[PDB]
Amino acid sequence: GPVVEKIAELGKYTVGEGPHWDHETQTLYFVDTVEKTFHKYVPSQKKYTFCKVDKLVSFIIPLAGSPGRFVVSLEREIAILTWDGVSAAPTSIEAIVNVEPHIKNNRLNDGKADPLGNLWTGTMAIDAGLPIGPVTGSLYHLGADKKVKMHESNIAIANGLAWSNDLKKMYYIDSGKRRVDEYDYDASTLSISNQRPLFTFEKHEVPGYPDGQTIDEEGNLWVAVFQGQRIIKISTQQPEVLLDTVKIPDPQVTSVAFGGPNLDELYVTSAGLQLDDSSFDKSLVNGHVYRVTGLGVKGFAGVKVKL
Ligand SMILES: [Hg+2]
Ligand SMILES: [Hg+2]
Ligand SMILES: [Mg+2]
Numbered sequence: 001g002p003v004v005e006k007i008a009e010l011g012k013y014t015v016g017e018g019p020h021w022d023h024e025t026q027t028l029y030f031v032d033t034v035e036k037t038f039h040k041y042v043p044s045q046k047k048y049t050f051c052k053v054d055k056l057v058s059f060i061i062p063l064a065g066s067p068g069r070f071v072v073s074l075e076r077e078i079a080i081l082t083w084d085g086v087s088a089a090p091t092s093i094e095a096i097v098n099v100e101p102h103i104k105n106n107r108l109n110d111g112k113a114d115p116l117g118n119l120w121t122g123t124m125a126i127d128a129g130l131p132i133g134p135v136t137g138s139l140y141h142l143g144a145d146k147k148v149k150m151h152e153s154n155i156a157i158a159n160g161l162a163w164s165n166d167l168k169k170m171y172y173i174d175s176g177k178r179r180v181d182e183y184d185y186d187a188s189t190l191s192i193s194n195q196r197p198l199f200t201f202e203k204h205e206v207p208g209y210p211d212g213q214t215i216d217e218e219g220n221l222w223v224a225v226f227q228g229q230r231i232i233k234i235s236t237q238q239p240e241v242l243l244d245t246v247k248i249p250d251p252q253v254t255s256v257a258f259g260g261p262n263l264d265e266l267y268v269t270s271a272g273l274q275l276d277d278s279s280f281d282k283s284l285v286n287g288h289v290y291r292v293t294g295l296g297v298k299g300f301a302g303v304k305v306k307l
Helices: none
Strands: 003-006 016-022 027-032 037-042 047-052 060-062 069-074 077-082 092-098 106-113 119-125 137-142 148-155 158-163 169-174 179-186 191-200 209-215 221-226 230-234 242-247 253-259 265-270 290-293
Touching: 016 060, 016 106, 016 209, 016 253, 016 265, 027 060, 027 253, 060 106, 069 092, 069 106, 106 158, 119 148, 119 158, 137 158, 148 191, 158 221, 169 209, 179 209, 191 221, 221 265, 230 253
Parallel strands: 158 209, 209 253
Antiparallel strands: 003 290, 016 027, 027 037, 037 047, 060 069, 069 077, 077 092, 106 119, 119 137, 137 148, 158 169, 169 179, 179 191, 209 221, 221 230, 221 253, 230 242, 253 265, 265 290
């Protein structure tokens, strides 16, 4: 079976999240969504750095055409951070837009660029809860003239995103729904329609909650299972098809991104945050980063945000 390696050099994270593989510099970026920190790992040189801010963060994506600059979330603001990748604080911060200026207890959560470079991201209550809690989030994309457009509401925990290779489908996770949804995606109008369930956890006895996801070159989705101690591989050709399961030692698996020189090593983040209603004892919940090899598939390099 696949080899799952704990990345010792990286330590433990409260809620490690938002992995992004920059293929030209062979570098993994990621965040901690509770500790207000950004992280950089260069596997070939065993180099790790971090950056501290004073707002909650949930994604970090290189800015297309601007080395040393990243598009990030700072609470409810989408911003450009100028960061040399090694100093413990940003050089400067340029706010782009506040997506929800008058919802004081919301935050941005997962974000990713579509294959065209458009940033998509969703919000949630800071005090969201599973299985039941306040449902206050929405799904946005950042469009022309730095204005966002809204595509879906009534989202409890805005999470993983992916797009099909032919640009006809988008896949999206609200963790509270315990399913992955598929949508028809119109790349020319950047609109989504015909929402329907692709994969429903209860139909397949999958525990936990879907969190982050990514898609491989064959069109399979790889989904992180929070409180499931696993990643799952699901079909996009047929609804409700579980293709494979890979166990990850950490129970609270949060997200996934393909990386390595040949885009065939799957990086997996997890959360060490100990929750009061967990299905796993505290001794099991650590928050390591993992690397999975031997899956027999390749993914895609992480896409930069175009502004
Ligand atoms: Hg930073
Ligand atoms: Hg940054
Ligand atoms: Mg997430």
